[PDB]
Ligand binder design. Sequence first.
Ligand SMILES: OC[C@H]1O[C@H](O[C@H]2[C@H](O)[C@@H](O)[C@H](OCCCCCCC3CCCCC3)O[C@@H]2CO)[C@H](O)[C@@H](O)[C@@H]1O
Ligand SMILES: *C(=O)CCN[C@@H](C(=O)O)[C@](C)(COC(=O)CCCCC(=O)O)S(=O)O
Length: 265
Amino acid sequence: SPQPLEQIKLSESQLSGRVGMIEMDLASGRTLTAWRADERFPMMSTFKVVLCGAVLARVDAGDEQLERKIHYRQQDLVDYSPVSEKHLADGMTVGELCAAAITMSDNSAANLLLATVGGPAGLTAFLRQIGDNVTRLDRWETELNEALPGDARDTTTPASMAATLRKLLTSQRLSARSQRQLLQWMVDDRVAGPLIRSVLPAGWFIADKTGAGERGARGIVALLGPNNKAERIVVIYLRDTPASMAERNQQIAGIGAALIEHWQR
Ligand SMILES: OC[C@H]1O[C@H](O[C@H]2[C@H](O)[C@@H](O)[C@H](OCCCCCCC3CCCCC3)O[C@@H]2CO)[C@H](O)[C@@H](O)[C@@H]1O
Ligand SMILES: *C(=O)CCN[C@@H](C(=O)O)[C@](C)(COC(=O)CCCCC(=O)O)S(=O)O
C-alpha cells in the first residue's frame, strides 16, 4: 500500500466521491491524519454510538436505568428491526436496545432510544452540552440517511465525530462503568466487526460502528491498533459516489491497509 494520504486521494479518484478521514490517538487526541476533516458528511447509522452516549449520560445522572424495560407496538417499528421485531410481546431493556442499535443497527431500537433522549433535537442538545457544536441530528430512522446533496441535516464532520467519540469513551463526562459499556457495545458489533477481524492481521484490535446511505454514502467510526490495543480512533466517511457497496467497502479497507502498513507516524 501507499501512505495513508496517498491512499485516501486514490480512493476519491477511484470512487469519484468525497472521502473524509481522521486518525486520532485515543488517549491524547493527537491528530495524525486529517483529510476533509472539517467537511460535512451524513452520519448514517454511526449516529447510534452518540445516541447511546446520551442514554448513558442519563443513566449516570439517575434519570435512566439500562435495566428499564420498554414495551412497544408493531406499528412503532421501522424498516430493519432484526432484534426489536422479536420482542413485541416481552419488550426490551434500555441496555438491550442500545446493544441492538449499535451491534445490529436495529432501527426501531434506535428510534425507541431517540425518543427517551428528546428526539433528534434532544440528541443535538446533548452534543452541544459535550462541546460538539457541529454534529447535528435532524431526523429519525430511517429518513436520516437520505444524504441529499448540499443538505446539512443529520451530518457530522470527521474532526467533530472523532472528538466526540473520544469525549464519550475517555473524558470522564461518562462514569467509568458507562465508558466501559459504550466501548463494549462497539467491540460487539455484529454487522462489520467479524468481517473486519477476518481481514485484519493477527494482533490488531477493532471496535466499530458502520453506516450506509443514499448516493453512495458510507462510513465507519472505529478504534484500531496493534498489540491488541485500542490505540487510535479512525473515522472515515464517503459521500456522492455512484460506486457499488463492495467497492466502497474495498476502498475503506484500502485506507485501513495503508494505516496498518505505515502505523508509526
Ligand atoms: O505487513 C503488515 C501486514 O500486511 C498484510 O496485512 C494486510 C491484510 O492481509 C489485509 O487483509 C489488510 O486489508 C485491510 C483490511 C482493513 C479492514 C478495515 C479497516 C477499517 C479499520 C478502522 C477504520 C478504517 C477501516 O491489509 C493488511 C495491510 O496491508 C499481511 O497479510 C500481514 O501478514 C502483515 O502483518
Ligand atoms: C445505517 O447506516 C443504516 C443504513 N441502511 C439501513 C437504513 O435504515 O437505511 C438499511 C435498512 C440497511 O441496513 C442494514 O443492512 C444494516 C447495516 C447498516 C450499516 C451498514 O451497512 O454497515 S437500507 O437498506 O439502506
